[PDB]
Coordinates of N, CA and C (backbone and C1' of nucleotides) in Angstrom, one line a residue:
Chain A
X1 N -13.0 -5.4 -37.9 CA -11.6 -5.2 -37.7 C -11.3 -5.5 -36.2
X2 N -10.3 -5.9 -35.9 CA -9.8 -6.1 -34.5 C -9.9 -7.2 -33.9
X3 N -10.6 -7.3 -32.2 CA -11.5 -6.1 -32.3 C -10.9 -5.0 -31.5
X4 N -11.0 -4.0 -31.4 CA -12.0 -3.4 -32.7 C -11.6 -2.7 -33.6
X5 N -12.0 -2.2 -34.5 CA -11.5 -1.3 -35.2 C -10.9 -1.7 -36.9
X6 N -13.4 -9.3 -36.1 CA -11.9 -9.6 -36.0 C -11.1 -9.4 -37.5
X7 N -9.6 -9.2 -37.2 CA -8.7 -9.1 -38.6 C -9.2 -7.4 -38.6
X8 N -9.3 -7.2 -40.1 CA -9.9 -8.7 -40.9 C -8.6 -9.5 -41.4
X9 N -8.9 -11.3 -41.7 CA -10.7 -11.1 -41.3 C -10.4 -12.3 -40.3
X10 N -11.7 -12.7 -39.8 CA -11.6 -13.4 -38.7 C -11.3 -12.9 -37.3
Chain B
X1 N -14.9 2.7 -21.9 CA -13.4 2.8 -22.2 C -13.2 3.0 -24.0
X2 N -12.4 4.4 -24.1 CA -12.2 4.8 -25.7 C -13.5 5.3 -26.3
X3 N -13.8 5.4 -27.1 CA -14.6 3.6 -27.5 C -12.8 3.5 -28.5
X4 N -12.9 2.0 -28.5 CA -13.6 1.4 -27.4 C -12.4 0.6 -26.1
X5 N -12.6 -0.3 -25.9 CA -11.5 -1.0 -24.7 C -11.2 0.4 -24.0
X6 N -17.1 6.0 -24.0 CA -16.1 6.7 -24.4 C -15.1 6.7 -22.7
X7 N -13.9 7.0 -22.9 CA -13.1 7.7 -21.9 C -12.4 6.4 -21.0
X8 N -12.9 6.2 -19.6 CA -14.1 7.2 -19.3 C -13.9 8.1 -18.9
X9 N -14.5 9.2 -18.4 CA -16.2 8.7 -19.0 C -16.4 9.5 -19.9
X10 N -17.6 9.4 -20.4 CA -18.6 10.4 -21.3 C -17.7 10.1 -22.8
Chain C
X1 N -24.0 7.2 -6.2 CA -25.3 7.1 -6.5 C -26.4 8.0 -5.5
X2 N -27.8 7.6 -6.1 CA -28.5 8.2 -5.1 C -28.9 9.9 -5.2
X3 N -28.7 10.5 -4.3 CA -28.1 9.9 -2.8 C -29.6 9.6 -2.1
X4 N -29.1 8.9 -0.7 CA -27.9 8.2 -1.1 C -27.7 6.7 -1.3
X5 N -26.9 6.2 -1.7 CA -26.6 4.9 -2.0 C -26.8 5.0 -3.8
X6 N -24.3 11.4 -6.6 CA -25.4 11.1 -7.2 C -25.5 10.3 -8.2
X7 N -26.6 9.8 -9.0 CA -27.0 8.6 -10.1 C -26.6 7.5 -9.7
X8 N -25.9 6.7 -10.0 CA -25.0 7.2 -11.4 C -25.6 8.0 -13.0
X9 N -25.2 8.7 -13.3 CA -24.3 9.9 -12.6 C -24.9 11.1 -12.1
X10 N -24.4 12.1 -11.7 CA -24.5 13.7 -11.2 C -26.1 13.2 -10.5
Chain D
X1 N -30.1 8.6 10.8 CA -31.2 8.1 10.1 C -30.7 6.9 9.5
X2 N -31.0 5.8 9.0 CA -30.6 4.7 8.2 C -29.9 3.7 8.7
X3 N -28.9 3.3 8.5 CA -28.1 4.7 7.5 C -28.7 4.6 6.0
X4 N -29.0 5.5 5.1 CA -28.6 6.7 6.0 C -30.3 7.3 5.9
X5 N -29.7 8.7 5.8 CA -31.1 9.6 5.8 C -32.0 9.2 6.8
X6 N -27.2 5.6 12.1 CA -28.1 4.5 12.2 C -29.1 4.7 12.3
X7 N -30.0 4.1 11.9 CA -31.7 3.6 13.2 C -32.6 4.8 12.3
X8 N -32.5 5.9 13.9 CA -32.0 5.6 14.7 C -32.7 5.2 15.9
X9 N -31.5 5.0 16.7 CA -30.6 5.1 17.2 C -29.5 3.5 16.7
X10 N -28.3 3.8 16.8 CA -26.9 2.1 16.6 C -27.7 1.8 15.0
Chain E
dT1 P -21.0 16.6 20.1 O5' -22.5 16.0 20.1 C5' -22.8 14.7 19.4 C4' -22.5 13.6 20.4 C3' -22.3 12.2 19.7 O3' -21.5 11.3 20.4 C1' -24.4 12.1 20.8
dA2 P -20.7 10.2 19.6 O5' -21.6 8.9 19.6 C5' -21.8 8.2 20.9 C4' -23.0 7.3 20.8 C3' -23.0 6.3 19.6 O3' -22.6 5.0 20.0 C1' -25.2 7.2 20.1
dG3 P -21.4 4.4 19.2 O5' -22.0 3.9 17.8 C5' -23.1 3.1 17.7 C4' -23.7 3.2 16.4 C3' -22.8 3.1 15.2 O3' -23.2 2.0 14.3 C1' -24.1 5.0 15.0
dT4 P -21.4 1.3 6.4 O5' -22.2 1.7 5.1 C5' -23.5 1.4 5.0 C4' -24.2 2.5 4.1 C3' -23.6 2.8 2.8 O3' -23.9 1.9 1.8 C1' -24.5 4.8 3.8
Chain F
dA1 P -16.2 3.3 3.1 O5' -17.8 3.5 3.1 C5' -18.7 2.5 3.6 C4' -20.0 2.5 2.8 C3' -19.9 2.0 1.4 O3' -21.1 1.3 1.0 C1' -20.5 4.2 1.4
dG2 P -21.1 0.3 -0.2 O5' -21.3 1.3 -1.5 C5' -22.6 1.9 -1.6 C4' -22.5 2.7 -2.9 C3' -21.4 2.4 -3.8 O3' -21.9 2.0 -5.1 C1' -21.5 4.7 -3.4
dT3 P -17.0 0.0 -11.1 O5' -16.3 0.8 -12.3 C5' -14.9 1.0 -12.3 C4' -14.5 1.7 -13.6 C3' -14.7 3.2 -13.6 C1' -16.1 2.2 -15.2
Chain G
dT1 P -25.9 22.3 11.4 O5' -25.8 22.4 9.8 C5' -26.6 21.5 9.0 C4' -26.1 21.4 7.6 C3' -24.8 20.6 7.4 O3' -25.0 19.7 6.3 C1' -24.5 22.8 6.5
dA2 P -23.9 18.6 5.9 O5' -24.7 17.5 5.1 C5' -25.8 18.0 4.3 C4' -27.0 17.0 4.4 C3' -27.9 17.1 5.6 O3' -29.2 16.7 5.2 C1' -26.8 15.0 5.6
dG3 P -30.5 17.1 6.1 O5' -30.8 15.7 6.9 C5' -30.6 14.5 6.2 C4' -30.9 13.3 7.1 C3' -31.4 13.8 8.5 O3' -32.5 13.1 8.9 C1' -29.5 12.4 8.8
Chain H
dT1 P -9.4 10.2 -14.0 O5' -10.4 11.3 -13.5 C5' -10.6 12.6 -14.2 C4' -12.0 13.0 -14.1 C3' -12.5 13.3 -12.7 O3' -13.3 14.5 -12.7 C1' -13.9 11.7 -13.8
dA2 P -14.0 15.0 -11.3 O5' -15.5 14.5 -11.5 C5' -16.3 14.9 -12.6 C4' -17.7 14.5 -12.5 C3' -18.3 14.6 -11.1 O3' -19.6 15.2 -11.1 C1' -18.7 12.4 -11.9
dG3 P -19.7 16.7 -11.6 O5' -21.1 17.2 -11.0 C5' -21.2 17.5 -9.6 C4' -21.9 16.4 -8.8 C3' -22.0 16.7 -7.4 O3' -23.4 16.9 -7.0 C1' -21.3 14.5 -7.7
dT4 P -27.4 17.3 -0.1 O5' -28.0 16.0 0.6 C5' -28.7 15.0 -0.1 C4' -28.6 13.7 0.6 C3' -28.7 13.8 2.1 O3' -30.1 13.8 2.5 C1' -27.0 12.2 1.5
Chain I
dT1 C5' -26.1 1.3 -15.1 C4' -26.4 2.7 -15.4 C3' -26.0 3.2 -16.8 O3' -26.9 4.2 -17.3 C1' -24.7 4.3 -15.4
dA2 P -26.9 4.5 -18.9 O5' -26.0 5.8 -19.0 C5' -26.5 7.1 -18.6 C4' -25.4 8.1 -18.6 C3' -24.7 8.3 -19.9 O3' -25.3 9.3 -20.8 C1' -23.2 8.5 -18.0
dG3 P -25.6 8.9 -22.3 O5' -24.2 8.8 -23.0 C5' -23.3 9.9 -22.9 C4' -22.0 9.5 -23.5 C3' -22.1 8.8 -24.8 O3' -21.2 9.4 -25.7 C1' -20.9 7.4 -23.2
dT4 P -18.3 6.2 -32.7 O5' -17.3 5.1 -33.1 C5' -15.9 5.2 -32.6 C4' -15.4 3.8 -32.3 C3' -15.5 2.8 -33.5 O3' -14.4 2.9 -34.3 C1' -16.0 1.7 -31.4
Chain J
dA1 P -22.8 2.3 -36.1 O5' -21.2 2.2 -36.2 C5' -20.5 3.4 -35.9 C4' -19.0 3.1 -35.8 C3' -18.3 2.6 -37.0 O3' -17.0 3.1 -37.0 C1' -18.3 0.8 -35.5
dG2 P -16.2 3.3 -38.4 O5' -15.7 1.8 -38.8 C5' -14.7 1.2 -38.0 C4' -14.4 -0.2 -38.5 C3' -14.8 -0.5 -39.9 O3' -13.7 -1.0 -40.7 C1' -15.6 -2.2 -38.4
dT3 P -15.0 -2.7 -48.5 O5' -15.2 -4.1 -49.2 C5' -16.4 -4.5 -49.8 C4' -16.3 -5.8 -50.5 C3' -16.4 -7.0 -49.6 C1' -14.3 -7.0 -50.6
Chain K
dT1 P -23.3 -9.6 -17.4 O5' -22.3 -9.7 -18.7 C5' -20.9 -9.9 -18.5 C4' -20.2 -10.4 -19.8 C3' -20.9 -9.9 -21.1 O3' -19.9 -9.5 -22.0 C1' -21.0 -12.2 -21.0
dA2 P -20.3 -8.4 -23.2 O5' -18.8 -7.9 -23.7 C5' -17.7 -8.8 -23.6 C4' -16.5 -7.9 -23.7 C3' -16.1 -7.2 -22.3 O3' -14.7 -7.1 -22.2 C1' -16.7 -5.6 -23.9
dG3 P -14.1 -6.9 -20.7 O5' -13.8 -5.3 -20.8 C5' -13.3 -4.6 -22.0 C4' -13.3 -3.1 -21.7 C3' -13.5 -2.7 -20.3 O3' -12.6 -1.7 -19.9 C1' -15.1 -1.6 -21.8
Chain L
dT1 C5' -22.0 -14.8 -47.3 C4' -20.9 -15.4 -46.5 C3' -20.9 -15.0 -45.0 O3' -20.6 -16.1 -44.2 C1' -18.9 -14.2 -46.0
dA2 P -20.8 -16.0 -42.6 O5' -19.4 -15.5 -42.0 C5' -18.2 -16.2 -42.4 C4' -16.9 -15.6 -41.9 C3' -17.1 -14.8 -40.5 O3' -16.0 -15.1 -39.6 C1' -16.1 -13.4 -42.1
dG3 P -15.7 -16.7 -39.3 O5' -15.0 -16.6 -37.8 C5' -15.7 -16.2 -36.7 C4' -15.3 -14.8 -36.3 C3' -15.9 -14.4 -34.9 O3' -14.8 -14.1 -34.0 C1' -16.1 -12.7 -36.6
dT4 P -14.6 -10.5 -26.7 O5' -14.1 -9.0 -26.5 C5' -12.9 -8.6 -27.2 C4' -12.9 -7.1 -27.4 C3' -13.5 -6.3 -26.2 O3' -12.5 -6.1 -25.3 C1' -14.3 -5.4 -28.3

DNA sequence: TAGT
DNA sequence: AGT
DNA sequence: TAG
DNA sequence: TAGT
DNA sequence: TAGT
DNA sequence: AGT
DNA sequence: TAG
DNA sequence: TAGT
């Protein structure tokens, strides 16, 4: 996720 | 930093 | 830091 | 002293 | 007293 | 002086 | 009473 | 935010 | 450096 | 850590 | 070469 | 599978 917490997605 | 971008500190 | 030049950290 | 702990002495 |  |  |  |  |  |  |  |  994110970042943080990439995307998603990507 | 956070976590994230801990604290700080600690 | 150090000392000297405490830690990082304490 | 040092610095630390100048010189010494300057 | 000097002088990180 | 030495996130 | 930092050295 | 810390602790010679 | 410690510490999602 | 966060199909 | 995350912060 | 993916991409601070």
């Amino acid at each position: 996720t994110x970042p943080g917490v990439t995307x998603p997605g990507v």
